[PDB]
Structures are given as structure tokens and as C-alpha cells.
Design a protein around this nucleic acid. Structure first.
Ligand SMILES: Nc1ncnc2c1ncn2[C@@H]1O[C@H](COP(=O)(O)OP(=O)(O)OP(=O)(O)O)C[C@H]1O
Ligand SMILES: [Mg+2]
Ligand SMILES: [Zn+2]
Lengths: 48, 89, 99, 97, 34, 86, 122, 50, 166, 76
RNA sequence: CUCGCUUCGG
């Protein structure tokens, strides 16, 4: 009927693992690819 | 005693502090932020949150002071309660 | 002014004030005199329990203008804040649920 | 904000934090520097160690390991800046017990 | 419109340096913070 | 000055060169058939250790009928170091 | 929220019936308005499962009866699942054991069936 | 402080735990002696000694 | 039906402190694990007992009492061969819809194994003749959350004979 | 049983804070308050009456612990 | 608003 999913757990940060990201991982993490060097549109609304 | 607990007289400057302490975040916060952070990323050094400064940064109660101990509730209870017997087994 | 020294180790806070000081010998060494104007601004969130219900009712009835009083009411069930300058304060005081 | 003209709040400088540490008042230090200034709730993926949004991790394309976590907002800004600097901070979460 | 009482008396009233769009009938704070 | 691009370049840009067709002959097809035969026969070989299935729901009289039986090779422990005897 | 073992121990419907009756009487003895209003699905599942078990012949069972039945069947070398199914279903007709109950071949012996019927009816 | 225009800051803790910690650990009655050498800091001053 | 061992961190608010700890722990755990399907486990029904209950911490945050509890709970999870007696609460052309009595309307027997007079012509016709029995075949569970049910099971109706009802 | 029998000031501060937080959140009171609308004053009264239902769990650095009742400790 | 610069206060 209804699946049991835990709402919230009192998670506490234990330690921070520093590291590096490969170029593939950067693409996986990112949402969009930025290719336009301009910022706003030509029209007077100047939407991004 | 702090200056001479590792067998060598270590100053309070950034060099002696780097040789004494181990937490990456405190070293970055004190001096040479970029160099310390990049070196930690290169080494893959996992840093715990034992120290006070990293506790403050992470927004968690620090271990020193009132946070050294843990409190228990003296609730009316019975640990290891009687278990309902299994008939089929 | 970096993140570590300006925004992580030491950062600005709300619920604080800064005023010129003047002497007052008639106060005990563990007491400090606060201006009425500052006290009307710096608020403390008191949780409604079985002990202070009759006191918080009077504080709510006074409103945000008379000094012993409150500025906001946060309901237990819904987290929608209610500004006490508007609405019937007597009804809100009569509807103070625990928590 | 900073100034009175901009309705800013007072600042707990480094020495104020040092005095609070010397007193040993851990709870008040936490309340002043986290709860009352820049408290925030982020979503951290327990598998990849990166920050997710709205209970969802885009990196792992999953939502099973995403857990909410209280944190100062300045710390989140620091983490995102470090990620932009290719210094990836991966958080290994655990239960408070 | 007010999300609580449904009125349209939404007034922009800043209270001590806090911009705030609030219902003028029941006082429900619709939006706050800028 | 270079033009501004409204959409990102296609995920798989096209190429006007295509891969050279594969070599053909009796030998190459024999290689393909032999490789497929090796795939089919070395999974049933006892060297291919399978993941041990676990968490049997119940025991049944049909177990003896469905009991998986397979001959097991015996390693020469004389050459192998002593630590790997079961 | 992790489970240590999802198959720790199989139990018959009698244990579930006894537990549900005990939970129902405890709940009716300790009815709480706020707790009940927080989650009513507990009442639904308990009541409906208890009704379903009551529709089954699971009534008139006792721990002594279950122990005697298990001891009687322990000489028939049947599997735990078979005796569990026999206890839950309470077969009065032979055909339930003959066909519906699995592992029928070579196990019925055409003579042990009568003894099994006598034991389940006892 | 010297009451020559000096400005002082005043924070209001927003938690019962923080309030209790402030009252117990940082009460004025609880910090009459400096930790440097134990000498009393809160004592009589000019126009009180005289 | 099978017992399942679970370990949970139960948070009891301070306004229930006068209650005995075990009773309120059981109440909260039942409220959390009622009418819910645990993945790869099955539909949990209720708490059987609380075996191990260790110390009650109170955290510097919420201020309530957090206790780690080891408990055994009853769940409904057949063993891929169990025999059930359900009632027909519906029927589709591709398969009948039998519901365990007020238990769970999730049993959907496919009509691909009976004697060769099988079809459902949308008029709720069960079977052309030559308390409804069931043989569970396979368990299956699925997740729910995938963006910013879960137990159905297949049912066998072999040539059981069914002298009482065809 | 090896640590100090005296209840440290940090222990007092944290016990009072937790007790006041519980009382403010509608926990039962054990000392029959007399017109005290402040939770912290009620907590201090409970501590003076030695009726606080809290057990301190003093942790040794290696990992070992020991439990002290608030009534078991010595207050000043 | 951001940033810098000055002048203050202490
Ligand atoms: N740059 C500063 N850093 C820290 N505190 C300061 C600073 N400038 C002023 N103050 C505050 O003002 C006080 C300085 O006063 P002090 O130097 O003792 O008397 P004064 O200004 O010499 O007065 P007289 O000239 O003796 O009449 C102490 C300190 O809290
Ligand atoms: Mg001065
Ligand atoms: Zn992830």
C-alpha cells in the first residue's frame, strides 16, 4: 500500500574528505554548459 | 609544555602551528588559506571535526567546555524487557 | 574580510543592540539597565507551557506598544507568524495553545 | 548587514569568540554564531558527499542517500567556493548517536 | 490576495527596517524580507 | 570576432569519416566463433566461481531435486602456499 | 531503520491473533486522543487483520495445542513450511494435504494421510 | 569603560540552554576574580574608595 | 508472516516523560511502522516486542529523549510458495483482482496457468466451470521517490481440484 | 567512581539549560512551582531540591564512561 | 546595492 521511507534522521557531519574532481565528474555534477560570452538578451527587458 | 611536547621547541608562528596542529580547516583559517587548502586537496587529507575552530565553522557544539560530557534522561524504564515467547519455534 | 575571518570565525548577529553607557550605582552588580526603546525591539521567544500561560496571555493582550508584551505569535501546528499590531489581540490571547 | 544606517546587527569578533571559548559556553557560542546569524538547512548526499537540492542529488541521479543537515550559510558558501576552485569537500555524514 | 482570510487588502508596511507585504484585515504576513 | 552560440554543440558531433569495414575471411570468422565458444564454455568451467546464493526462504523436499551439482577441480596444494587450503 | 534479518523466525497465525487481541485490548484500555489522531492506520491494520484471522479457523488455538501438534508432526519428518501451512489452514479434508499442500509425491504414502488428518483434527 | 562616550554592545540569547549557560558560567557574581592571577577585578572604584 | 529484527532511534518529546518509557516507545514505533511496506522485507503490521532498549540520550538540540531500540516486529511476507485464502475484490480482463480479506488489495493473479477455459470478458466472469485459494509465486518491491504499489506479488491458481467450489 | 564527586560549573550550566528547555516544552515539574513563569528559575529550584531527572555521563578520553546522578553529585 | 576613499568616535 504505502512504502515506508524515513522522513528525517539526525545526521551529524563526521569528517570532511578533501579531494579533486576529474573533468568527467565536473560534467556530471554540472547542470548546463556555458557557451555564450554575453550576459543579457538584446531586448530592453535584458533577460539573462 | 605545549611548545615542547613534540620533543622540539615549536613557535606560535604559522610554521610551528602547522607542525603542531593537524586539522586542515584551522590551518587554512589562520594563515595561508589557499596554499593549505590546495595541499590538503592534493593529499586527500580527511579532516575530522574534533577541534574547536572546525566545530565553530561547521555549526556543531564544541567538545571543550559544557560539551565534553553527554546527558542522560532518568526516565522510568526497564532495559531488556521480558520478551513474548514464540510458540511455533 | 575573507570568509574564514569575516564570515566564519566572527560574524554579525541579530537580536543585538549597541548604546552609549552611563553610570547607575543603584543597580546590583549583576544587573544592567536597558532602555525601554531597545527592550521593545529585542524580543525573546518564550514557549507556551502550563506555567506561563496566564502571563503570556497578558503579554499578548498588551500588544507591541505597551512595554510588557509581545511582537509576534508563532502557532504550534502551522508555522505562520502573526504580527500582533493587527487582528484582535484578545482572541489571539484566548487561543494560545500549549507549544 | 553592517551599519546602523542599513539597520545592521552587532558583530561577534574573533576575540568575542575567544572569550566565549574561554568561558567554555559551547551552547551559547553555537546559538550566537549559527542559530541567530546564518542558520540554514542543506541537503547532503551520503553516497557522493556532495550537496544536493530539495532532497535530490543531481550527481548521483538518486534521492535515497540525500539527508538534511543544519549548517551555517557561510560554511555552505565556503564549500561551494571550494568546489568551484576544484578543491572538492566531500562530507561523510553519520547519525548523531 | 491574503492566503488566510482571502482578502485583497495587501499593504506594503515596513516595520522597523523590515519590508513586509501583509494583509491589512487579519494581519497575515504574506511576504517579508528583501 | 567569433559569433555567439545560442545552443550547446550537439552531444555527438557528426564525422565525415566512417570506420573501415572489418576484415573478412575464413580465419576471422573462425576467430569469432572460437571466441563465442570460449565465452559459452568458460562460464560453466569450475574456475568460474559464481557468487554464493544465500538467504534460502525455506527448506523443502524438492531441494534434493533442485540441488545444484557440479564437479569441483582440486588445486595442487604442493605448489600453492599453505594458507589457501579450505 | 535497517533490518537485521527479514526472515528471523516464521510464526503461525495463532501468535499474530494473540498479539493482535492483546494490542487491541491494551489500546482500548489506553486510548489517547492525540496519539490516535496522529496515526489511525494502526487501528485500521490491526482491526482488519484481526477480522481476517477470525474469519480463518485460527480461533480455538492454544500454545499447548500448537506444541502438541508440532510434537506429533515431528515424527513425520515434514519441513517447517509444510507444518506451518497445515497449522494455519487446518485441513479437515484429505484433498487439502493430497494436492494443495506441496511435496505431495512420495510423501503421502497413502497411510500417513489418515494419521495426519487425525492429528490435525486433534 | 570610562563613561566618556564609550559604546557597549548587548546580545540577547534566543535559547533556554544558551540563557542558562550565560547566567551560570558568565554571571557577574561568578566572575569576581580574573583567571590570570585570581585577583578580584569587580571592586570599589573612585568616589567609593574616597 | 515472519518476525523481523529492527533497530531504530526513537525520539520521545519531553511532554510524555511521565509515561513509562517502554509503553511510549512501543506506541511511537507502532505509529511509525504501521501499514507501511519495508523494501525487500514486506508489509509491516505491528510491533511484536522490544528486545533491547539502551540508554536514553538527550541531545544539545531538540531537548527530547533519543533512545536506540532493538525490537522484533511482525510483517506479512510469504515464502514464494505459501497458500492463501483471499476474496475476489475485482477482476480485469488480463487477470483477476483478489484481495486478502481487508488485509491488502494487492494480489493480482495472472490467468495464464489454469485449465484451457480461461478468460475475463470484463463482466467479472471468473472461470468457465469445468473463499478463493492462492499460491504465492514471487515477491517484488519497488521504490517511490525519484524526483526533486511497492508490493504486488504474483499468484498461482493450479489445477487444485477445489471439490467444494469447482 | 574515580572522577571528582563535586558537580562542575559546566555540568551545572548544561543541566540547568537542558532542564529549562524541557520545562519550557511542557515537561512535568517536580517541585510544585510557586508563581514562577521563568523556566530557568524553575530549573534552579529543581536543582536546589535535587529533583532533576537527569544523569550525567562523564566520558573518559580513551572511551570509557561513568554515570553520575545529579542528586548523587555535590553542589555548591 | 557593491566597492573603495576620507573624517570621526572609543
Ligand atoms: N585603538 C583602540 N583600541 C582599543 N581600545 C581603544 C582604542 N582607542 C580607544 N580605546 C578605548 O579607550 C580607552 C583609552 O583611554 P586611556 O588611553 O586609558 O585614557 P586617555 O585617552 O589617555 O585619557 P587621558 O588623556 O589620560 O585623559 C581604552 C580603550 O577601551
Ligand atoms: Mg572611553
Ligand atoms: Zn550523490
Amino acid at each position: 500500500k504505502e512504502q515506508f521511507r524515513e522522513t528525517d534522521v539526525a545526521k551529524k557531519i563526521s569528517h570532511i574528505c578533501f579531494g579533486m574532481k576529474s573533468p568527467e565528474e565536473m560534467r556530471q555534477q554540472a547542470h548546463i554548459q556555458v557557451v555564450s560570452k554575453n550576459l543579457y538578451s538584446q531586448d530592453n527587458q535584458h533577460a539573462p | 609544555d605545549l611548545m615542547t611536547y613534540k620533543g622540539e621547541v615549536l613557535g606560535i608562528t604559522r610554521f610551528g602551528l602547522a607542525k603542531m596542529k593537524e586539522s586542515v580547516l584551522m590551518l587554512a583559517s589562520f594563515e595561508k588559506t589557499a596554499d593549505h587548502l590546495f595541499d590538503a586537496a592534493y593529499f586527500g587529507q580527511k579532516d575530522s571535526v574534533c577541534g574547536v575552530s572546525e566545530c565553530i565553522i561547521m555549526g556543531i557544539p564544541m567538545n571543550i567546555g559544557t560539551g565534553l560530557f553527554k546527558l542522560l534522561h532518568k526516565a522510568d524504564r526497564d532495559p531488556n524487557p521480558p520478551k513474548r515467547p514464540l510458540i511455533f519455534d | 574580510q575573507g570568509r574564514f575571518r569575516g564570515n566564519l570565525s566572527g560574524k554579525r548577529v541579530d537580536f543585538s543592540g549597541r548604546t552609549v553607557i552611563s553610570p547607575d550605582p543603584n543597580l546590583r552588580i549583576d544587573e544592567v539597565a536597558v532602555p525601554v526603546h531597545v527592550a521593545k525591539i529585542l524580543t525573546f521567544p518564550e514557549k507556551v507551557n502550563k506555567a506561563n500561560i496566564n502571563f503570556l496571555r497578558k503579554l499578548v493582550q498588551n500588544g507591541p506598544e505597551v512595554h510588557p508584551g509581545a511582537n509576534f505569535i508563532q502557532q504550534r501546528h502551522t508555522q505562520m507568524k502573526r504580527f500582533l499590531k493587527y487582528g484582535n489581540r484578545e482572541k489571539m490571547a484566548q487561543e494560545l495553545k500549549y507549544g | 548587514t553592517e551599519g546602523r544606517s542599513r539597520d545592521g546587527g552587532l558583530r561577534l569578533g574573533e576575540m568575542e569568540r575567544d572569550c566565549l571559548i574561554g568561558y567554555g559556553a559551547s551552547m551559547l557560542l553555537l546559538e550566537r554564531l549559527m542559530i541567530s546569524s546564518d542558520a540554514f538547512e542543506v541537503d547532503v548526499c551520503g553516497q557522493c558527499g556532495l550537496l544536493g537540492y530539495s532532497g535530490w542529488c543531481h550527481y548521483c541521479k538518486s534521492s535515497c542517500h540525500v539527508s538534511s543537515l543544519r549548517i551555517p550559510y557561510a560554511c555552505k558558501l565556503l564549500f561551494q567556493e571550494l568546489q568551484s576552485m576544484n578543491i572538492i569537500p566531500r562530507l561523510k555524514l553519520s547519525k548523531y548517536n | 490576495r491574503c492566503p488566510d482570510c482571502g482578502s485583497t487588502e495587501l499593504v506594503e508596511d515596513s516595520h522597523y527596517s523590515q519590508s513586509q507585504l501583509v494583509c491589512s484585515d487579519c494581519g497575515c504576513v504574506v511576504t517579508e524580507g528583501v | 570576432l567569433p559569433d555567439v552560440v545560442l545552443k550547446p554543440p550537439p552531444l555527438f558531433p557528426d564525422t565525415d569519416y566512417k570506420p573501415v569495414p572489418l576484415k573478412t575471411g575464413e580465419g576471422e570468422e573462425y576467430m569469432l566463433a572460437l571466441k563465442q565458444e570460449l565465452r559459452e564454455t568458460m562460464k560453466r568451467m569450475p574456475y568460474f566461481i559464481e557468487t554464493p546464493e544465500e538467504r534460502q526462504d525455506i527448506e523443502r523436499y524438492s531441494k534434493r531435486y533442485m540441488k545444484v551439482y557440479k564437479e569441483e577441480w582440486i588445486p595442487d596444494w604442493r605448489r600453492l602456499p599453505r594458507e589457501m587450503m579450505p | 531503520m535497517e533490518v537485521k534479518d527479514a526472515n528471523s523466525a516464521l510464526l503461525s497465525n495463532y501468535e499474530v491473533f494473540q498479539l493482535l487481541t492483546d494490542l487491541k485490548e491494551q489500546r482500548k484500555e489506553s486510548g489517547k486522543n492525540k496519539h490516535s489522531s496522529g496515526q489511525q492506520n494502526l487501528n485500521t491494520i490491526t482491526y482488519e487483520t484481526l477480522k481476517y484471522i477470525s474469519k480463518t479457523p485460527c480461533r480455538h488455538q492454544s500454545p499447548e495445542i500448537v506444541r502438541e501438534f508440532l510434537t506429533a508432526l515431528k515424527s513425520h519428518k515434514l519441513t517447517k513450511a509444510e507444518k506451518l501451512q497445515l497449522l494455519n489452514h487446518r485441513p479437515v479434508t484429505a484433498v487439502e494435504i493430497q494436492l494443495m499442500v506441496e511435496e505431495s509425491e512420495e510423501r503421502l504414502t497413502e497411510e500417513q494421510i489418515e494419521a495426519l488428518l487425525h492429528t490435525v483434527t486433534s | 569603560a570610562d563613561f566618556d562616550g564609550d559604546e557597549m554592545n548587548l546580545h540577547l540569547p534566543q535559547t533556554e540552554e544558551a540563557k542558562a549557560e550565560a547566567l551560570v558560567l558568565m554571571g557577574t557574581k561568578a566572575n569576581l576574580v580574573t583567571p590570570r592571577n585570581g585577583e578580584p577585578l569587580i571592586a570599589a572604584i573612585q568616589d567609593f574608595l574616597t | 508472516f515472519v518476525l523481523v529484527e529492527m533497530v531504530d532511534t526513537v525520539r520521545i518529546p519531553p511532554w510524555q516523560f511521565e509515561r513509562k518509557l517502554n509503553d511510549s516507545i512501543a506506541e511511537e514505533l507502532n505509529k511509525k511502522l504501521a501499514n507501511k511496506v519495508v523494501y525487500n522485507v514486506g508489509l509491516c503490521i505491528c510491533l511484536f516486542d522490544i528486545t533491547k532498549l539502551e540508554d536514553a540520550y538527550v541531545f544539545p538540540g531538540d531537548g527530547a529523549s533519543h533512545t536506540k531500540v532493538h525490537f522484533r516486529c511482525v510483517v506479512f511476507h510469504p515464502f514464494l510458495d505459501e497458500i492463501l485464502i483471499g476474496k475476489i475484490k475485482g477482476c480485469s480482463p488480463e487477470g483477476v483482482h483478489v484481495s486478502l480479506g481487508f488485509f491488502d488489495d494487492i494480489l493480482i493473479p495472472p490467468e495464464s496457468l489454469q485449465q484451457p477455459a480461461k478468460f475475463d470478458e470484463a463482466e467479472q466472469v471468473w472461470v468457465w466451470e469445468y473463499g478463493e485459494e492462492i499460491r504465492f509465486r514471487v515477491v517484488d518491491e519497488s521504490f517511490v521517490d525519484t524526483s526533486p504499489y511497492t508490493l504486488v506479488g504474483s499468484i498461482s491458481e493450479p489445477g487444485l481440484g477445489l471439490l467444494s467450489w469447482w | 567512581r574515580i572522577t571528582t564527586p563535586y558537580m562542575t560549573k559546566y555540568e551545572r550550566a548544561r543541566v540547568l539549560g537542558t532542564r529549562a528547555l524541557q520545562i519550557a516544552m511542557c515537561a512535568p515539574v517536580m517541585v510544585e512551582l510557586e508563581g514562577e513563569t521563568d523556566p530557568l528559575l524553575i530549573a534552579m529550584k529543581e536543582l536546589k531540591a535535587r529533583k532533576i531527572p537527569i544523569i550525567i555521563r562523564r566520558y573518559l578520553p580513551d572511551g570509557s564512561y561513568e554515570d553520575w546522578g545529579v542528586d548523587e553529585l555535590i553542589i555548591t
